[PDB]
Amino acid sequence: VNLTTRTQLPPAYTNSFTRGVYYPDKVFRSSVLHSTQDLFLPFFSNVTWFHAIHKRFDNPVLPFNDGVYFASTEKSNIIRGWIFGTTLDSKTQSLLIVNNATNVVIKVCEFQFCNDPFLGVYYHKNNKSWMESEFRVYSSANNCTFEYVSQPFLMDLEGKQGNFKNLREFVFKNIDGYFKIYSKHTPINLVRDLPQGFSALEPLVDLPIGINITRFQTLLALHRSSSGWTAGAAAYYVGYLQPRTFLLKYNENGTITDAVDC
Amino acid sequence: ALDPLSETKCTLKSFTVEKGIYQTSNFRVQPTESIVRFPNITNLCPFGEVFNATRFASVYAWNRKRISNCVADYSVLYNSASFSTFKCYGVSPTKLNDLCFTNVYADSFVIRGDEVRQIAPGQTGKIADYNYKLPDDFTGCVIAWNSNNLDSKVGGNYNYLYRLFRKSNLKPFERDISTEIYQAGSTPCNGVEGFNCYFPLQSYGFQPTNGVGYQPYRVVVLSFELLHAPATVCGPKKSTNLVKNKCVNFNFNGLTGTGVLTESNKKFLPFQQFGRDIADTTDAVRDPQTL
Amino acid sequence: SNNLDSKVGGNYNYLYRLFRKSNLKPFERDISTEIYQAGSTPCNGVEGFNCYFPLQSYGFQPTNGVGYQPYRVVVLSFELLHAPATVCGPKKSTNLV
Numbered sequence: 001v002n003l004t005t006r007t008q009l010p011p012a013y014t015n016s017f018t019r020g021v022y023y024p025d026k027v028f029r030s031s032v033l034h035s036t037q038d039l040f041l042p043f044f045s046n047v048t049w050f051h052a053i054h055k056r057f058d059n060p061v062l063p064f065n066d067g068v069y070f071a072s073t074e075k076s077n078i079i080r081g082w083i084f085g086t087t088l089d090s091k092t093q094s095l096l097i098v099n100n101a102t103n104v105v106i107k108v109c110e111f112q113f114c115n116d117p118f119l120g121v122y123y124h125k126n127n128k129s130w131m132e133s134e135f136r137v138y139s140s141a142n143n144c145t146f147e148y149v150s151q152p153f154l155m156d157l158e159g160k161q162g163n164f165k166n167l168r169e170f171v172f173k174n175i176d177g178y179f180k181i182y183s184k185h186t187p188i189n190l191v192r193d194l195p196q197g198f199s200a201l202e203p204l205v206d207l208p209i210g211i212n213i214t215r216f217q218t219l220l221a222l223h224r225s226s227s228g229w230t231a232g233a234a235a236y237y238v239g240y241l242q243p244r245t246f247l248l249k250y251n252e253n254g255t256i257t258d259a260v261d262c
Numbered sequence: 263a264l265d266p267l268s269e270t271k272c273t274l275k276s277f278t279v280e281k282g283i284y285q286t287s288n289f290r291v292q293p294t295e296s297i298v299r300f301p302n303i304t305n306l307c308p309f310g311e312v313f314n315a316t317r318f319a320s321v322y323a324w325n326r327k328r329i330s331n332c333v334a335d336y337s338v339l340y341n342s343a344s345f346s347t348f349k350c351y352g353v354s355p356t357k358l359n360d361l362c363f364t365n366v367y368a369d370s371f372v373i374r375g376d377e378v379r380q381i382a383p384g385q386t387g388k389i390a391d392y393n394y395k396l397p398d399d400f401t402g403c404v405i406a407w408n409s410n411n412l413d414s415k416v417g418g419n420y421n422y423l424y425r426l427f428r429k430s431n432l433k434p435f436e437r438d439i440s441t442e443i444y445q446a447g448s449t450p451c452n453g454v455e456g457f458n459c460y461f462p463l464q465s466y467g468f469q470p471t472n473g474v475g476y477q478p479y480r481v482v483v484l485s486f487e488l489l490h491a492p493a494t495v496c497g498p499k500k501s502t503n504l505v506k507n508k509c510v511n512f513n514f515n516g517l518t519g520t521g522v523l524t525e526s527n528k529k530f531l532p533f534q535q536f537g538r539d540i541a542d543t544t545d546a547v548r549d550p551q552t553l
Numbered sequence: 554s555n556n557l558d559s560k561v562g563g564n565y566n567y568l569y570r571l572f573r574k575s576n577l578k579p580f581e582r583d584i585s586t587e588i589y590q591a592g593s594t595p596c597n598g599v600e601g602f603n604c605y606f607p608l609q610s611y612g613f614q615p616t617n618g619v620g621y622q623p624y625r626v627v628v629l630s631f632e633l634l635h636a637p638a639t640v641c642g643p644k645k646s647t648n649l650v
């Protein structure tokens with residue numbers, strides 16, 4: 001059940017400076033200047049500022065279109081994942097990305113639309129817990145046309161305070177059925193708003209699903225001591241990708257030194 | 263080609279060679295041998311375990327095995343003599359090894375040998391019409407082996423059923439588990455047995471003493487479906503030995519070329535397999551097997 | 554040719570090579586009946602594992618559809634200016650000037 005109070009606010013805009021830079025492919029280039037055309041996030045663009053606090057909890061559904069830029073600033077790892085698909089329901093094949101703290105779950109099945117798809121954590125008090133309890137993301141899975149399971153891991157769900165120590169910036173797109181995952185995770189120190197720095201994303205994996213994704217969601221984590229759940233202080237970023245050309249500078253090793261939007 | 267002096271006459275197109283230096287051609291060293299380096303043959307889909315699985319679903323109840331994101335090597339199963347018969351439709355068994363498939367559905371079931379001959383595109387009979395029908399464009403193959411020492415036992419094996427009666431003929435790739443009683447005449451049935459009301463499903467008698475044509479055979483039908491989605495399951499990639507510091511024709515993953523391979527002090531990013539120069543011509547690669 | 558070459562349900566006088574170990578060169582007639590050997594198992598002239606009998610027949614029936622109706626195909630080949638042409642149509646020659 002969607003939280004009773006929350007808040008209703010217009011989509012306030014922010015400007016991402018160097019965000020949107022990634023290696024277009026697995027080609028290695030060093031000490032050279034390469035220029036290619038692809039779907040990119042232009043520099044100094046006006047992105048929408050998304051956030052989660054103890055009384056707003058803004059998690060709108062946005063269209064994916066050609067491509068969308070993802071960025072997040074984390075402490076307690078409030079981001080539970082992303083839900084992908086056309087109608088985001090069992091009417092079509094929907095892609096699921098969620099971290100259960102055990103195995104990364106990537107599955108394409110028939111999903112029952114979750115109005116408020118999150119994972120709650122209860123009974124902190126003494127023995128502070130911070131462990132998963134119920135899965136509200138999807139009610140059931142049916143025709144699982146695709147499934148993927150990664151290796152086991154351990155995620156820290158304990159809440160943190162102070163500056164944001166984690167920065168997750170992702171770039172997803174779809175080209176001829178190929179779904180590219182561009183993942184970069186770097187530590188930062190930030191109070192509010194957005195961190196200022198250059199980042200070069202690297203491709204993680206590819207998902208040759210071959211479906212059209214017209215909408216996407218951003219999973220979040222809630223905790224309380226489904227209308228009574230609260231949330232920590234965190235913010236993530238969303239922006240639209242455009243077919244732009246960049247000039248990528250390369251060092252000896254191969255790491256991008258700087259990028260120039262044409 | 264007799265002498266280098268004669269190469270001057272042929273390049274200048276004159277029988278008289280004037281005094282001076284002339285470039286008559288440009289030599290190039292041809293590759294000595296072809297180098298093939300492919301990724302590890304592991305992380306397959308276990309077709310040998312499903313083909314060799316103890317028990318199967320009924321021909322109408324057949325289990326749909328979804329095969330995606332793996333490699334399918336069909337040369338090992340064909341050359342291992344693990345099957346009774348081998349048959350394909352439209353594609354040779356060697357061509358399947360060089361092709362990538364979007365989605366593959368393994369059809370497992372056990373029927374008698376007299377009913378195996380009805381498996382083919384757009385055919386008729388008991389199993390084709392009333393159980394499982396093959397489309398005309400079906401590109402897969404038919405593989406069966408003799409299970410009479412496994413799936414049959416003394417006293418009969420009633421686990422494997424089939425659909426004897428249906429009011430019509432099934433479409434290709436149509437699985438119908440409906441137990442509704444077939445009404446032969448005008449006598450009402452409504453799921454109640456009686457005159458002209460007969461239970462359609464029937465259980466195969468299976469014992470080790472059955473005749474060859476009546477012996478139970480495990481049949482695995484491989485459904486090869488090429489959709490608009492990118493291809494996932496690909497044929498086997500068999501890597502060969504690696505040669506360095508020589509002129510060779512190399513094919514690495516989906517990249518081909520000719521040159522001299524030398525290990526340098528350069529370091530690629532772990533997510534970047536191939537390097538290139540200013541001209542986007544590959545100056546270095548990473549081996550698909552060894553790092 | 555369905556009005557002629559079609560005989561009963563099939564005609565075995567018209568055969569073809571279904572299988573071959575490689576691609577035959579153009580303008581080549583291969584009469585070899587040898588069994589195709591895919592693997593290392595010796596065929597010795599019989600069918601079996603990795604052994605298939607390449608010689609097959611086209612089914613010819615007068616009641617078959619237009620897809621199975623045999624079409625006699627005569628490929629016309631020629632050489633250009635490689636020799637004096639002794640085949641020329643009834644075009645009357647003229648005087649020389």
Ligand SMILES: *[C@@H]1O[C@H](CO)[C@@H](O[C@@H]2O[C@H](CO)[C@@H](O)[C@H](O)[C@H]2NC(C)=O)[C@H](O)[C@H]1NC(C)=O
Pocket residue numbers: 251252253254
């Ligand atoms: C390529 O990356 C390597 C590893 O990070 C660099 O080597 C290190 O560079 C740092 C720079 O502060 C030094 O402090 C380390 O002592 C170096 N380690 C070794 C063992 O060399 C390398 O300099 C980078 N090269 C370039 C030009 O980017």
Ligand SMILES: *[C@@H]1O[C@H](CO)[C@@H](O)[C@H](O)[C@H]1NC(C)=O
Pocket residue numbers: 001002114115116
């Ligand atoms: C959220 O609100 C919608 C109506 O706007 C309601 O249908 C839904 O049931 C509410 N939450 C849940 C998860 O039930």
Ligand SMILES: *[C@@H]1O[C@H](CO)[C@@H](O)[C@H](O)[C@H]1NC(C)=O
Pocket residue numbers: 012013014046
């Ligand atoms: C970006 O959005 C902010 C907030 O709406 C606005 O004040 C600013 O003028 C915008 N800048 C551009 C380039 O449109």
Ligand SMILES: *[C@@H]1O[C@H](CO)[C@@H](O)[C@H](O)[C@H]1NC(C)=O
Pocket residue numbers: 100102105132135
């Ligand atoms: C998440 O992990 C819990 C605890 O191990 C387990 O009970 C649950 O089934 C998992 N859920 C998912 C979606 O993997």
Ligand SMILES: *[C@@H]1O[C@H](CO)[C@@H](O)[C@H](O)[C@H]1NC(C)=O
Pocket residue numbers: 127129131
């Ligand atoms: C603390 O919580 C953990 C996880 O729920 C539980 O396993 C453990 O028994 C609890 N310990 C105490 C002292 O309550």
Ligand SMILES: *[C@@H]1O[C@H](CO)[C@@H](O)[C@H](O)[C@H]1NC(C)=O
Pocket residue numbers: 091142143
């Ligand atoms: C999913 O499977 C069920 C049962 O096989 C089938 O009825 C349904 O049509 C399938 N999904 C779609 C979208 O058809």
Ligand SMILES: *[C@@H]1O[C@H](CO)[C@@H](O)[C@H](O)[C@H]1NC(C)=O
Pocket residue numbers: 210211212
């Ligand atoms: C995706 O959209 C394209 C272009 O409109 C259309 O051709 C195709 O059928 C769509 N595919 C899916 C899976 O919806």
Ligand SMILES: *[C@@H]1O[C@H](CO)[C@@H](O)[C@H](O)[C@H]1NC(C)=O
Pocket residue numbers: 310313314344345407
């Ligand atoms: C099945 O596996 C067993 C154990 O490896 C083996 O002995 C048997 O021959 C196999 N049968 C076939 C034909 O796959």
Ligand SMILES: *[C@@H]1O[C@H](CO)[C@@H](O)[C@H](O)[C@H]1NC(C)=O
Pocket residue numbers: 301302550551552553
């Ligand atoms: C692949 O197989 C080889 C066999 O020697 C092994 O050494 C290697 O670790 C395996 N994994 C990789 C990296 O391909």
